[PDB]
Amino acid sequence: EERIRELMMPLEVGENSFAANGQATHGNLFYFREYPMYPGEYVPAEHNTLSSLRDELRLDLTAQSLKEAWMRVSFQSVDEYYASVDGLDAEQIGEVLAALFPELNCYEAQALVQRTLECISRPVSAASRQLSRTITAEAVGLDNAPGHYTNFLEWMGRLTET
Amino acid sequence: GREGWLFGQQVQLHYHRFPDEQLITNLSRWRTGETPEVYMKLNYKNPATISRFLTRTGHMYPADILPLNPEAVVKLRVAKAQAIRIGLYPRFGNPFWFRSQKFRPKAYQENYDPTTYYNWVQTDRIRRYFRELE
Amino acid sequence: VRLLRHESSMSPSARAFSERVAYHLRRSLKACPGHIAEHIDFTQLIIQEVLGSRRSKEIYIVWFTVDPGARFELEPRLHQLNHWVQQLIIKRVKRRPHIPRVT
Amino acid sequence: VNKQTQKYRTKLRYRFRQPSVVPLRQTLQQRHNTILEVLRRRR
Amino acid sequence: ATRWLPFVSSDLKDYLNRYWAVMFTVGARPIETGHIRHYVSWYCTRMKVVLLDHHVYVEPLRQQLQEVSRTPELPLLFVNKKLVGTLRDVELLEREKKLKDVLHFGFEWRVGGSVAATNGQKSLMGALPAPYGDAEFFRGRYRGPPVARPVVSLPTLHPFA
Amino acid sequence: DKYRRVPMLLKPQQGGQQYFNHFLIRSTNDRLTQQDVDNVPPPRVLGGDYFKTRFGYSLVKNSEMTQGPVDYSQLDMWGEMPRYTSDMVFLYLVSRRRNTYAVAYTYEGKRILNTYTSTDNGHQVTSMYLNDLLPKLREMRASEGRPMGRGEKVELVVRVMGFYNGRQGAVRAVQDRANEFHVRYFEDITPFPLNGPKMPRGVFK
Amino acid sequence: RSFLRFLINSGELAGLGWGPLWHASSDFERKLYKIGFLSGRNPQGVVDHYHQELVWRYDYQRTRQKQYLLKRRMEGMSRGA
Amino acid sequence: VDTMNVLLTRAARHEHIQVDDVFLLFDELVALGARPDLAAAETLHTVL
Amino acid sequence: RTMVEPGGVDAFSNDCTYAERLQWSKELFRIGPSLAPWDWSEMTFVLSPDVDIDWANGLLALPYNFDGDALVRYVEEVQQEAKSRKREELLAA
Amino acid sequence: TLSPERVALRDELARKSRLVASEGMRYYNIFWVRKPLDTMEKEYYELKRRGVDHGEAIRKVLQGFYSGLAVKKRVAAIQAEEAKLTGRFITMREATVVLGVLAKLHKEQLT
């Protein structure tokens, strides 16, 4: 009965349906919230966000593990800093990751290489990922230069964190 | 039964706008190579052509609404005057109006909608054609 | 609007201008521009009067339809005429306190 | 100029005129919006 | 210096090159043309409306409009030889306050983020990047004022407005 | 104020707080369901006899065969205009500020009844004209040689002039007699002005 | 439960209850719970409170249901646009 | 539970931590009136 | 075809007499302008032994003995029904 | 694009070919129309390299076009006639229409 009445239910002022609730004189006087009020109500967190956080933590911790392994095994000059060449190369990171982790996919291996390369500068560096959504390539006029766009996004996020 | 009819008639899949449209389209495509004669008819003999530029009443549209080549306007006006003189065009009114309009609604609509921009008879024709075929 | 201005609630000059405007509007309403005439269904339209303000800054043409269902076919076309109406006022009536805004 | 031409010229002059457009209605609307914003934000 | 002649051209590009803001319409869509006229006149920009019902070169201009706009929608507006779109797009630009600039100067802001949704003056609260993300896992995060909502539809004042 | 003493939480007095959680959960469930799911021409008429019975007028001519005619035909002066057949009564209703006239004419332009004479004025004049006209139509058609036939309603072309109030009343009066008068064309006759004769000064100045 | 089900549903079916105004009254479960509270499941009290249910003023269920369904429809239309 | 999520995340991403101490902090939080959540469970799972 | 452009006319499919076909063409031409105000780009006129008016499938089959006045009557009825339907819907809204 | 003289004679040839086509010939169902028109314009080019009185040259090429169209028409007639006489194979278009119309009749009889 209730599930059928849900679709039969009126929503416009018509015949035997009318807004005597002061909506015409006062307007919308009843609040209605779409968020669960923390202590009382509960709704399960979305799995897209769950997976996002889990993946970010996985990548960060793997990058730290590799950095500590490199330090176990083994200062940056101005020229090297400008060249952005770290203690390890992308090819080296890719080969070691592929050797130690067979099932890990090509895309995930590239992601691990990027994160390990970037953790030498900044561990989390989560500001650039977010700023990418606020600022777009076309807006900054840098559309067919993805490398420059990402370089600027990293620069700007790491400056914003200050 | 009749035997010349089977060899005369040919089966068509879909009807044409008019039977030679495919030939005309191919001819035009080759003429362009890819892989106005209205000033001649805008005269007192062509009531439909002169009416194509008049309002529902038989008078002139605004210049903004129906802009034209000045020679076309002069010829339109003189032709309308001469035809009305002779009595080949009503002194007040404009037949051919609906015939001239182009944005026409459908039979079951009230306004023109810009979005608009095997029948049993031919089935029986096919059936009888094949019945005679054997 | 809330009320409807009474015939006795307007100055004699505005009243005079109003009946002139009503006369000319009723006489010439079929001779509107063709691109609006071709869509206006004159069979339904009716105009009760024109009221206007004191000194006729504004004119209020009171209108309706024979069948109420035609108001929403007629209203936009009628509002596309508010310039033609002003030109008609300019052309035909000579004693006008001043050329008004049509509503 | 003949009388007919004079009258028609005046008719055209009135029919096709470019009026002086100054944004007074927009200015008043903006002032009204500012007044509402102030009334809303301050007592 | 020369007699007045109404302009006509079979090419949409001639109209774009000649007129700043040009709208193509028909007499069967008075309300949409009225709304676009309202917006343009409110922003005080010279605009030319062309009715295609009696326009000669109607089919050429119509097919050219359809191929440039990728849709049959007769009420169409053009500024700086570009397409702003139909009444829905004009209303969208009015909503996010980009129509003033697309009309006056001929460009849409690509900054990202809406300016219409504002509680007061426009500032940057909530714009800075969030460390680690996780804007959702602070269940006791600030949630804002108690927005109210209608119970029933409050019938529309006019079938057009 | 009169109610200054009551709390703001009681001014609207929100209620039903136990439904918000259920609504959130149901909305999420329905969103999941939607994601999983993701993963007018008029009627048809076929028979001629049916068309005749449904509409009251046979479509097929079903008349004398005048076959073998000339190979080219002349058009009508007014092709696009409505087809007024012989038995249509053309009634004109003219409105004015103070008065309203109503006359009825035969298809040949013959006046059937004399003229009769705001909104109520037009309504009454039209109703009286129709009441007096029906018998006159009876006698005229009988003299012609056309019996009425039981229940056969007279086919009518109604034409109105004047952008005055009386038009509404007169048309309502014509509508109220639908069972006997079948209106087929409702149209307007307000004339297109021209140079025309002089007009009174009071109109101008 | 049986007696109240009969009362409400049969009254409305015979055409003596809310009828077209059913959306103004809460659902059968809310009515059952509330009338049980108000009557202690006494028969005469159940009848009396079934009649008095015309008067209930602190039932917000239908208000919130209309609000939620209207919001859902509005967001669906906005998505469709 | 929000304090648990925050501490676990900002610790697991810290450099000089020990997994023993991450799990000890989780144990102390749950011993206090903290409700474990799927997010904290995922964090501890990735760390393990 | 030129004045009432229907997108298709089929007079030569059915085996009738040439006089009948000429008569049907004459009747269609007569109707012509009275039928003009409506778009028939979807409907296809055809000669049939009986009338059928299929608006969904865009077919319009008529016998050589068909009243053009009657057909105009029917299409005007359809137009009036559509107009009244829109008026009633707008008033209800 | 095209060179102006070429487009000019191509336009006149297109009009003349249209007239010999669906007009008096009544050959709406022509096939591979490109070959006849191109061979005719090439023949015109030869006749103009020689010098053949453009009016006479266009008359000659148009007559050749007419002969080619007629022979094409009659060869098509030969194949159609003998294919219909032999009941083993008919053609593709009637196969499409039959396989559609039988389905439509099946649906109707279902209704």
Side-chain angles (χ1 to χ4, degrees), chain F residues 12-192:
Chain F
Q13 219 283 330
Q14 307 293 262
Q17 310 288 337
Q18 62 274 19
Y19 311 109
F20 287 139
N21 191 19
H22 176 42
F23 293 157
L24 307 190
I25 297 176
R26 193 222 299 269
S27 293
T28 310
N29 181 354
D30 285 13
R31 182 195 317 163
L32 289 173
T33 293
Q34 195 66 3
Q35 294 183 289
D36 299 303
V37 181
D38 165 31
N39 301 331
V40 65
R44 174 76 161 68
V45 63
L46 200 156
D49 49 0
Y50 182 65
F51 182 89
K52 189 179 180 291
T53 51
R54 204 193 175 288
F55 291 92
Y57 45 90
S58 62
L59 192 158
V60 186
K61 195 172 177 192
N62 188 344
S63 74
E64 54 267 47
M65 297 291 167
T66 312
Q67 291 189 0
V70 69
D71 301 347
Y72 285 111
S73 68
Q74 64 271 13
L75 293 66
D76 193 2
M77 283 180 298
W78 307 84
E80 293 180 353
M81 279 303 163
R83 273 88 177 86
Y84 308 110
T85 197
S86 189
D87 281 0
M88 291 191 182
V89 163
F90 301 74
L91 74 164
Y92 306 90
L93 316 169
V94 170
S95 309
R96 295 177 198 265
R97 290 181 80 270
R98 162 182 176 285
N99 204 354
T100 181
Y101 313 83
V103 289
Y105 283 94
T106 301
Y107 170 85
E108 304 304 341
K110 168 162 180 33
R111 188 167 64 169
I112 292 181
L113 210 69
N114 311 338
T115 297
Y116 278 2
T117 285
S118 61
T119 313
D120 57 357
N121 191 325
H123 181 76
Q124 297 299 316
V125 168
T126 312
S127 68
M128 300 205 315
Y129 192 94
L130 277 298
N131 287 331
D132 295 334
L133 193 69
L134 188 61
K136 189 71 161 299
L137 292 193
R138 302 323 191 168
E139 284 102 14
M140 286 190 62
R141 285 283 179 272
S143 178
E144 181 65 26
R146 191 149 283 95
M148 296 299 96
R150 182 64 169 165
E152 183 259 328
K153 46 182 82 183
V154 63
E155 189 173 3
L156 205 74
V157 170
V158 62
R159 293 179 168 175
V160 302
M161 186 176 296
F163 296 129
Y164 287 108
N165 298 54
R167 186 187 267 162
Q168 178 184 9
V171 182
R172 297 278 173 91
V174 173
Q175 280 288 109
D176 302 352
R177 310 206 45 70
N179 57 61
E180 191 63 8
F181 300 84
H182 177 250
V183 167
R184 174 171 168 79
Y185 296 116
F186 179 75
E187 54 200 12
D188 190 311
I189 308 298
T190 313
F192 190 99

Side-chain angles (χ1 to χ4, degrees), chain A residues 21-94:
Chain A
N21 47 13
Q23 205 185 321
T25 61
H26 307 282
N28 315 311
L29 283 173
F30 284 117
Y31 299 143
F32 190 97
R33 52 161 193 266
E34 282 281 12
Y35 52 87
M37 185 179 288
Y38 171 33
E41 301 163 338
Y42 170 86
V43 186
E46 271 295 329
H47 301 269
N48 47 25
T49 311
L50 287 170
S51 52
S52 172
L53 186 61
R54 193 173 45 191
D55 302 342
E56 298 316 328
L57 197 146
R58 279 217 272 276
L59 299 187
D60 295 316
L61 190 154
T62 48
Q64 283 298 320
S65 70
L66 276 80
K67 180 195 313 311
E68 301 186 322
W70 157 65
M71 296 216 180
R72 294 268 302 162
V73 164
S74 292
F75 71 83
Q76 206 178 6
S77 178
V78 173
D79 289 353
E80 316 289 336
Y81 156 68
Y82 281 148
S84 80
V85 166
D86 275 311
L88 284 73
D89 186 357
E91 167 155 338
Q92 303 171 305
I93 299 309

Side-chain angles (χ1 to χ4, degrees), chain E residues 37-77:
Chain E
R37 281 184 144 138
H38 164 53
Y39 290 139
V40 171
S41 59
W42 178 258
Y43 288 87
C44 291
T45 64
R46 293 187 192 275
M47 186 200 199
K48 164 157 185 65
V49 183
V50 61
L51 273 290
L52 286 172
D53 63 358
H54 301 99
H55 197 268
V56 57
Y57 313 132
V58 60
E59 299 106 339
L61 214 61
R62 186 74 186 266
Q63 88 185 21
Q64 192 161 5
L65 281 163
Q66 205 189 22
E67 67 182 1
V68 66
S69 71
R70 196 162 73 269
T71 177
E73 271 280 331
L74 272 164
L76 280 152
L77 175 54

Side-chain angles (χ1 to χ4, degrees), chain B residues 29-73:
Chain B
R29 192 177 50 235
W30 177 80
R31 184 188 58 87
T32 184
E34 65 192 10
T35 308
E37 77 172 8
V38 165
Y39 61 103
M40 290 296 299
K41 288 179 185 176
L42 186 68
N43 63 27
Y44 69 98
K45 330 183 163 183
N46 290 249
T49 300
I50 55 179
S51 180
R52 162 163 305 108
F53 296 113
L54 295 171
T55 81
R56 196 182 288 235
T57 313
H59 304 97
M60 289 276 294
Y61 278 122
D64 191 313
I65 292 299
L66 195 150
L68 275 164
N69 187 358
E71 195 184 13
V73 172

